[PDB]
Short mmCIF file of C-alpha atoms in Angstrom, two decimals:
data_model
loop_
_atom_site.label_atom_id
_atom_site.label_comp_id
_atom_site.label_asym_id
_atom_site.label_seq_id
_atom_site.Cartn_x
_atom_site.Cartn_y
_atom_site.Cartn_z
CA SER M 92 -7.06 -252.07 129.25
CA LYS M 93 -3.97 -252.49 131.44
CA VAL M 94 -4.42 -256.11 132.55
CA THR M 95 -0.71 -256.90 132.95
CA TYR M 96 -0.51 -254.57 135.92
CA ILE M 97 -3.64 -256.18 137.37
CA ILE M 98 -2.42 -259.76 136.87
CA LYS M 99 0.78 -258.62 138.56
CA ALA M 100 -0.73 -257.01 141.68
CA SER M 101 -2.96 -260.10 141.92
CA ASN M 102 0.11 -262.36 142.27
CA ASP M 103 -1.08 -264.18 139.14
CA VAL M 104 -4.39 -265.47 140.51
CA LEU M 105 -6.02 -263.41 137.76
CA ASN M 106 -5.78 -263.99 134.04
CA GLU M 107 -6.31 -261.52 131.20
CA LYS M 108 -10.05 -262.17 131.29
CA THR M 109 -10.83 -262.00 135.00
CA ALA M 110 -8.64 -258.89 135.12
CA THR M 111 -10.47 -257.02 132.37
CA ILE M 112 -13.86 -257.87 133.88
CA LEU M 113 -12.59 -256.60 137.23
CA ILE M 114 -11.74 -253.15 135.81
CA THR M 115 -15.19 -252.72 134.28
CA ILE M 116 -16.91 -253.42 137.60
CA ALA M 117 -14.42 -251.24 139.50
CA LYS M 118 -15.28 -248.33 137.21
CA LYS M 119 -19.03 -248.32 137.72
CA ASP M 120 -20.68 -249.15 141.04
CA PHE M 121 -23.77 -251.37 140.78
CA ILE M 122 -23.06 -252.20 137.13
CA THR M 123 -24.98 -255.29 135.92
CA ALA M 124 -23.80 -258.54 134.27
CA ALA M 125 -25.64 -257.52 131.12
CA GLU M 126 -23.58 -254.33 130.79
CA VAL M 127 -20.29 -256.10 131.58
CA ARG M 128 -21.10 -258.43 128.67
CA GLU M 129 -21.77 -255.61 126.22
CA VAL M 130 -18.47 -253.79 126.78
CA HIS M 131 -16.55 -257.03 126.14
CA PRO M 132 -17.74 -258.12 122.67
CA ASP M 133 -14.42 -259.95 122.43
CA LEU M 134 -15.69 -262.51 124.90
CA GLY M 135 -18.44 -265.09 124.94
CA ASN M 136 -21.56 -264.08 126.79
CA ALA M 137 -21.33 -267.20 129.01
CA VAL M 138 -17.59 -266.67 129.31
CA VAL M 139 -18.20 -263.28 130.96
CA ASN M 140 -20.77 -264.83 133.31
CA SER M 141 -18.37 -267.62 134.28
CA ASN M 142 -15.51 -265.25 134.96
CA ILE M 143 -17.75 -262.92 136.94
CA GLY M 144 -18.62 -265.97 139.05
CA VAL M 145 -14.93 -266.81 139.47
CA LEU M 146 -14.50 -263.25 140.81
CA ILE M 147 -17.30 -263.64 143.36
CA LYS M 148 -15.87 -266.96 144.56
CA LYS M 149 -12.55 -265.21 145.18
CA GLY M 150 -13.78 -262.31 147.28
CA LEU M 151 -13.05 -259.66 144.68
CA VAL M 152 -16.65 -259.03 143.61
CA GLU M 153 -19.98 -259.43 145.40
CA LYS M 154 -23.54 -258.97 144.14
CA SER M 155 -25.76 -256.21 145.54
CA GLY M 156 -29.25 -257.23 144.48
CA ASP M 157 -28.94 -257.07 140.70
CA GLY M 158 -25.71 -255.09 140.57
CA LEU M 159 -22.02 -255.90 140.86
CA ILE M 160 -19.59 -254.17 143.18
CA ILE M 161 -15.94 -254.74 144.11
CA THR M 162 -14.69 -255.78 147.53
CA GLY M 163 -11.95 -254.05 149.52
CA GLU M 164 -9.57 -256.87 148.51
CA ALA M 165 -10.26 -256.03 144.86
CA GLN M 166 -9.68 -252.30 145.35
CA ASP M 167 -6.23 -253.00 146.82
CA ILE M 168 -5.25 -254.82 143.61
CA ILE M 169 -6.69 -251.93 141.55
CA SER M 170 -4.85 -249.19 143.47
CA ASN M 171 -1.57 -251.14 143.49
CA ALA M 172 -1.98 -251.79 139.77
CA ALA M 173 -2.72 -248.16 138.84
CA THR M 174 0.19 -246.86 140.92
CA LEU M 175 2.58 -249.29 139.16
CA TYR M 176 1.34 -248.18 135.76
CA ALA M 177 1.30 -244.50 136.67
CA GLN M 178 4.95 -244.54 137.72
CA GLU M 179 6.06 -246.36 134.55
CA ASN M 180 4.25 -243.84 132.36
CA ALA M 181 4.52 -240.70 134.47
CA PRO M 182 5.86 -238.20 131.92
CA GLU M 183 3.32 -239.43 129.37
CA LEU M 184 0.38 -239.12 131.79
CA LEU M 185 1.34 -235.75 133.30
CA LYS M 186 1.43 -233.51 130.21
#
């Protein structure tokens, strides 16, 4: 997971943890907190919940009923980030 690009496009508001949780939510619309927790065994279950909350208080994620979905702000960081990465790895990606 390419969190350095994310932390970069976020002007360093994001750390390695809030960045990795952001990608998971970005990747699956209406994903739940319980599934975000399961794909990050590395992290504490209450750590994931905290950092999801830190992402809602920043205007990057919002809750839709039971599910989690990323804001337009968040998708600017994601598209910036992936374009950065893609250009630094282009000949490796394009084969």
